[PDB]
């Protein structure tokens, strides 16, 4: 109920990195977690959302078929798995929690408990 995003920073096009949203507050069993991303110049987008019932939903068509959200309650952590990354995906990713819920609020909504996000970009990644 106090969140950190760990995960990872930038990758190459076609890459894959897993983002990890973990609680440092209290039990995330009773909450829905959504990942959103905010581009350096565009509106927030819902990326994916996992509910209380461990049901999942994907909110933006631009990312469907690539992104996956999953949970492991042993560690109060949800993971967002990225796959086949493209420059269109470079953004600050962050997660937020909503109580006793299976579904996430609109990306436009004031979000209740977000963490400081993770900057993820897609590029050459070496000399």
């Amino acid at each position: 109920v106090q969140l950190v995003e760990s995960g990872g920073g930038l990758v190459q096009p076609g890459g894959s990195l897993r983002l990890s949203c973990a609680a440092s507050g209290f039990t995330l069993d009773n909450y829905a977690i959504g990942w959103f991303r905010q581009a350096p110049g565009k509106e927030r987008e819902g990326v994916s959302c996992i509910g209380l019932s461990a049901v999942t939903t994907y909110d933006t068509d631009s990312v469907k078929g690539r992104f996956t959200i999953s949970r492991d309650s042993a560690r109060n952590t949800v993971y967002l798995q990225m796959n086949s990354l493209r420059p269109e995906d470079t953004a600050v990713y962050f997660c937020a929690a909503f109580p006793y819920s299976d579904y996430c609020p609109d990306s436009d909504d004031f979000l209740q408990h977000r963490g400081h996000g993770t900057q993820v970009t897609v590029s050459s990644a070496a000399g």
Binding site: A32, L52, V55, S101, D102, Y103, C104, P105
Partner: protein
């Protein structure tokens, strides 16, 4: 490629939960409205007219004379069990006490998971047969949905059996939690009965206060879609504090507590257990 219509938000959740994204939903009664009575719009008449299946609870919720659903299925030219299907059936049914009714039913069977499972299985039964070669996943989503509801049903029964026979009491305004009580080992106490009655009269208020003066819940609860002032006085003029709100009439909007059938039940089950446990 199948048109389905749900008469309300609880059915729509149980249905969305079974299809994922495979079937075309419509939910006639919106969140916060009472599926008890609603006047259908041209949109509801057309989506039921083009429906392949329509699901409803019935059991004196929406299946009587002035019931909106009954009028809809006839002015839209439909027939029972080919176009439309009841869901609240096979349930361990509660007949309304009914001093002025003399032989009718109480619709609130979804207030326990013991019957909540039945509803999800019945919705699925008349959907799988109607979408055979594309069925594939419906059987899995049912096993899982039910498995989750059952997990929770079992947690709930244990949480209640472990508190106190003398503390366990669901204190409500409208006495709709009758089903909750049978499944979870805890009787309800209401100000007024389900919609056969008047509400908030002194012979209802002081009756509930006498029971509070006599037996001892640690908390009082209120429904989502209700005026809280009546309960506010059975608590404050004579009583123990109100602890939380509980869900009855419909599914909450996304991101809010109780935004799915599983979720409205997780909320109620956890909040009622805590209110009485503490």
């Amino acid at each position: 490629k199948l048109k389905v219509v749900a008469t309300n938000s609880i059915i729509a959740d149980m249905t969305k939960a079974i299809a994922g994204d495979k079937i075309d939903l419509h939910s006639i009664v919106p969140i916060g409205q009472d599926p008890h009575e609603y006047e259908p719009l041209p949109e509801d008449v057309e989506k039921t007219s083009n429906a392949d299946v329509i699901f409803y609870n019935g059991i004196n919720l929406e299946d009587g004379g002035q019931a909106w659903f009954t009028k809809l299925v006839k002015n839209a030219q439909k027939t029972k069990n080919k176009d439309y299907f009841a869901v609240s059936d096979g349930i361990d049914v509660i007949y309304l006490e009914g001093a002025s009714e003399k032989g009718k039913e109480d619709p609130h069977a979804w207030l326990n998971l013991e019957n909540g499972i039945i509803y999800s299985k019945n919705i699925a039964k008349q959907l799988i047969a109607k979408d055979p070669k594309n069925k594939e996943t419906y059987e899995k989503n049912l096993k899982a949905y039910v498995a989750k509801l059952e997990k929770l049903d079992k947690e709930a029964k244990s949480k209640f059996d472990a508190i106190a026979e003398n503390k366990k009491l669901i204190v409500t305004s409208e006495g709709c939690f009758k089903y909750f009580s049978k499944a979870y080992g805890v009787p309800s106490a209401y100000i007024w009965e389900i919609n056969t009655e008047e509400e908030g009269t002194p012979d209802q208020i002081s009756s509930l206060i006498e029971k509070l003066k006599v037996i001892k819940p640690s908390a009082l609860f209120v429904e989502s879609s209700v005026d809280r002032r009546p309960m506010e006085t059975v608590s404050k003029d004579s009583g123990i504090p109100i602890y939380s709100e509980i869900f009855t009439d419909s599914i909450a909007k996304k991101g809010k507590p109780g935004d799915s059938y599983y979720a409205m039940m997780k909320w109620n089950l956890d909040k009622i257990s805590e209110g009485l446990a503490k």
